[PDB]
Ligand binder design. Structure first.
Ligand SMILES: [Cu+2]
Ligand SMILES: [Cu+2]
Ligand code: NA
Ligand code: NA
Length: 464
């Protein structure tokens, strides 16, 4: 097995600046080269490291021949620097953003938000990580050697053509069910191996698929200790056998490396349309962990962090967000999937470019749907009632609290700081507060993070 690639950990320079270059290059997957896109390289991106309380300016060079934008997913920053569809960086052009980091330690990420093209641009290879540190987290004595016992794990599926090129399409099928493929990548490599010191291994898991939800576990069933969610540390570890992760979500887990025997991180079959076609109809390796006897001192604390109380609910503004799909989209998509894949496509279970909607509207860039309060908790009620698709619903500008998730109180490891909530044929409720402003010219997005739904209308803008 190839060794797991580790995103460079990119800090500020003497002038408090970080340079990102967006560009095309070449990658090799199982023998055949593909044109890929990357930040500061051919594929994927670095891990931009930020400290709570410190400004940094990011200089962003668009070295594509097409428009793109750069969105910091998870960051509580003004709309100006949020990099939603209105933050065009022109091909050949340079844009600079000041990020004033004021939130708990967390693993966030970044990726394009090009209007109507976000799915293709991620599929082409564009994604990096954001490691936010603060004063609280460095006191915990967690595994902290980057790329040794503190390892980013970005999991994505891709589909490839006969010539080896990435085979991306926004069509009637993928607009309905998402883009998914048959090859799993972990930091860009097919089934890599990571060499991990005895003791505690820390993994920062990102589900960076366009459309495929995942479910982590190990091959010998050893536990994961969940220490952190999208928006950072939990109050204390949650110990699990398996860990479902939606598109765009991050969890940090600790795994015990307690003797010399190799095991795999795997992902278990999910009940989501399309996502259990072979080879994903059985447990599927993500990466091989190979124990090694070098220095490590990282520990698992009893107690991680102190989070705020849920605010009381009386008097909060409530906003209804109904997600919906043209029924014509569902049918033709369900059909195209059966024609192409046969009966396996359903295991576990006409212009489409505006067929997906929130509150009966496809995303309009020039009409924000509302102004949200600044600095005041609101309750957003997001409903997927009336359709059968999975919608990981994500809200920019914020880390929120899930009050109920698709019909139940959140699981314990999902009850902390989140920027994504599951919506799937039921209704979810989040408590949300915006500490920063967003004008109509640079509004915040709230959207399904199944990328093809987003691209085909399941997005709204809002101001603060
Ligand atoms: Cu985001
Ligand atoms: Cu969706
Ligand atoms: Na520069
Ligand atoms: Na253990």
């Amino acid at each position: 097995r190839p060794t797991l690639p580790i995103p460079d950990l990119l800090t500020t320079d003497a002038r408090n600046r970080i340079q990102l270059t967006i560009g095309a290059g070449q990658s090799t997957f199982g023998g055949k080269t593909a044109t890929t896109w990357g930040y500061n390289g051919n594929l994927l991106g670095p891990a931009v490291k930020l400290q709570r309380g410190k400004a940094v300016t990011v200089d962003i060079y668009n070295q594509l021949t097409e428009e793109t934008t750069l969105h910091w997913h998870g960051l509580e920053v003004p709309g100006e620097v949020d990099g939603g569809p209105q933050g065009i960086i022109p091909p050949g052009g340079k844009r600079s953003v000041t990020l004033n980091v004021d939130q708990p330690a967390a693993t966030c990420w970044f990726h394009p938000h090009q209007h109507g093209k976000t799915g293709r641009q991620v599929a082409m290879g564009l994604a990096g990580l954001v490691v936010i540190e603060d004063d609280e987290i460095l006191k915990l004595m967690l595994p902290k050697q980057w790329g040794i016992d503190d390892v980013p794990v970005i999991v994505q599926d891709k589909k490839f053509s006969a010539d080896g090129q990435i085979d991306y399409q926004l069509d009637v099928m993928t607009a309905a069910v998402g883009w998914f493929g048959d090859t799993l990548l972990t930091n860009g490599a097919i089934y890599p191996q990571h060499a991990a010191p005895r003791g505690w291994l820390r993994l920062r898991l990102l589900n960076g698929c366009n459309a495929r939800s995942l479910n982590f576990a190990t091959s010998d069933n050893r536990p994961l200790y969940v220490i952190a969610s999208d928006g950072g540390l939990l109050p204390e570890p949650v110990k699990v056998s398996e860990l479902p992760v939606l598109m765009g979500e991050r969890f940090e887990v600790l795994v015990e490396v307690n003797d010399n025997k190799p095991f795999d991180l795997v992902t278990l079959p999910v009940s989501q349309m399309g996502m259990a076609i072979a080879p994903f109809d059985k447990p599927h390796p993500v990466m091989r962990i190979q124990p090694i006897a070098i220095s490590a001192s990282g520990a698992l604390p009893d107690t991680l962090s102190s989070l705020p109380a849920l605010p009381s609910l009386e008097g909060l503004t409530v906003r209804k967000l109904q997600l919906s799909m043209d029924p014509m989209l569902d049918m033709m998509g369900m059909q195209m999937l059966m024609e192409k894949y046969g009966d396996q496509a359903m295991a576990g279970m006409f212009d489409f470019h505006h067929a997906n909607k929130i509150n009966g509207q496809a995303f309009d860039m020039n009409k924000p749907m509302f102004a949200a309060a600044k600095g005041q908790y609101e309750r957003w009620v997001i409903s997927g009632v009336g359709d059968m698709m999975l919608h990981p619903f994500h809200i920019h500008g914020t880390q929120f609290r899930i009050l109920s998730e698709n019909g139940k109180p959140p699981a314990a490891h999902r009850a902390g700081w989140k920027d994504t909530v599951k919506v799937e044929g039921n209704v979810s409720e989040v408590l949300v507060k915006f500490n920063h402003d967003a004008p109509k010219e640079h509004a915040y997005m709230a959207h399904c993070h199944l990328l093809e739904h987003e691209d085909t209308g399941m997005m709204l803008g809002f101001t603060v």
